[model samples]
Target: GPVPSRARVYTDVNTHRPSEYWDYESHVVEWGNQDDYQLVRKLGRGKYSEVFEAINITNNEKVVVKILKPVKKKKIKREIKILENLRGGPNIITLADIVKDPVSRTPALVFEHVNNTDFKQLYQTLTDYDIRFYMYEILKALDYCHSMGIMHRDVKPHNVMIDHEHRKLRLIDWGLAEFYHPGQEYNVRVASRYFKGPELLVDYQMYDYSLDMWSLGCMLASMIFRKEPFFHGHDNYDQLVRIAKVLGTEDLYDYIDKYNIELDPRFNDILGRHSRKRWERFVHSENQHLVSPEALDFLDKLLRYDHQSRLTAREAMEHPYFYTV
Candidate 1:
């Protein structure tokens, strides 16, 4: 007989340190001195900015300070507008204030401080029920953003934060987000390569909010399976092969026929070849006994080969899988 398994114990570690330990005084805002705000710790860093946990000296409330790297004036102004236009909701991170650096000419945006782990770190511990709850909250947030004409071009596990205390989810990291007006023309390649929609990859001039839906689907698949949603290659041509292997080349023929998308010259050798349908077979085979049926359903909808046929965040919220929760 199989031996009974023991329950694993998990604990949270507190590594709080003094503000001075982070050299916060040196990075204080020029307009508002360190006396005005108490720096807590360095939260995270990105290509264009460094985020820090801070506290208002007067109110003692926490905030996340995003300090932009020194850049052209136009870029700085554009970031200000983006932050200002982001209206907050239960699932969206709230922008609190904006500050400017007089000496180095850098800009900073203040946002609500959310002490929580992102989906990247939390996915390992999530049960089938937890994934459903998490996806539901994320979809509600995306639905609200779509209604307001905003497109979060980038959606991934790192940008989805989980508030365990309140059992809530918040979407963050809007650096590549953009506002889309109907019939408007824009030139930009924004979003991680693995999550980019087919239209965006083919360089479409005008795209709908469905681009975000594609990314959300990728995120959902990753969260539920604890694996990368898509495996991208070294370059665009190689990426297509990776995608074709999973989705099958035959499955892509309709999209190619409809959109007239041409395969890159380098991938011509394997352009029309079809691979085994591993995704469906793997799920229904012995693996079906490993995960709950609800998780498998969510994965099916999220990993569809046809982007046009993929479910939107709103539609996904009503999925029977989520109803099981």
Candidate 2:
């Protein structure tokens, strides 16, 4: 099965003027001296890059330093170009400058410093309104990127930096993002396992902006339900099974049938029919205040198994979840 027959495409190769956004490969990297910035503190590290809080020795301003590990040239280019293109877009992380380690020849990305606290510490104290408000802020970032013909393959808590007191959010880590062309297949192995959508789990490659919406939905689920990871699975196969247990294996099969996708043998053995677990079942005394008609309604639309059925980033902002917030 492929994306449903009625599914709409975002951009077409025929009329969509790719402009500078699609010139990923031919793009130039303007590397700078890593010495210009001094590492003040190590913020964090990921598989692809090492992040640090650094000071611009020249300007005495704070900036984030992303030291790249060895990675494909194309991947680095894609990230740089996408960030540059979406530089001024709403809540899209700003690419302040690019630098390189002269000795090791390792590339580093400089970004505007965001006063973001650890998500675990910040989220627990938030009221439901705060969640809705910040999520709306993230939606701005998603809508901005998708509008510029890019799919942010990575959208998770770690990548979404928020300044709690300032009430700001920046969708960071465009390294996994890629230029999206209508009807083209994409690499499904992008997001973290906990946030990966069904299309990625089942190896459906032709996903679009809807993919981010699904990831956003997962974030909402985790936040609203007060479980850091709403869907906790052991591995890739179990990820889908974990989702099916809650969203129902029946819809999963229907999605596979509709997309004409092949399930791995392991999934066939592990996956059994499951009724869609009611979202209400997740509501408890602890998180009852967070549960609302608008919250669940918006989440339901975004969490659909089929990509076509999921809301686009721009469309999701209009959802009632943010109306009252």
Best candidate (score: TM-score)? 2
lDDT of 1 by residue, 1-325 (tens): 1111110110011113232222222332324443455668998888788989989878889888888786554555544444455557558888777666555646677787777765455655666667777778888887776654567887876678788668878888777765555554445377777777665555554555667777776776555445575555565556556667777777676666655555456656755686746444545342233356666666667665555566666777778877865
Stretches > 4 Å off in candidate 2 = 1-9, 13-15
| TM-score of each model, paired residue for residue | 0.79, 0.95
Q: Return model 2's CA RMSD, one decimal.
A: 1.8
lDDT against true structure, model 1: 0.63
User: Could you tell me which residue pairs clash in candidate 2?
Assistant: 1-259, 1-260, 1-261, 2-259
Per residue, candidate 2 scores C-alpha lDDT tens digits across 265-287 of: 88878888889988889999999
lDDT of each candidate versus the true structure = 0.63, 0.85
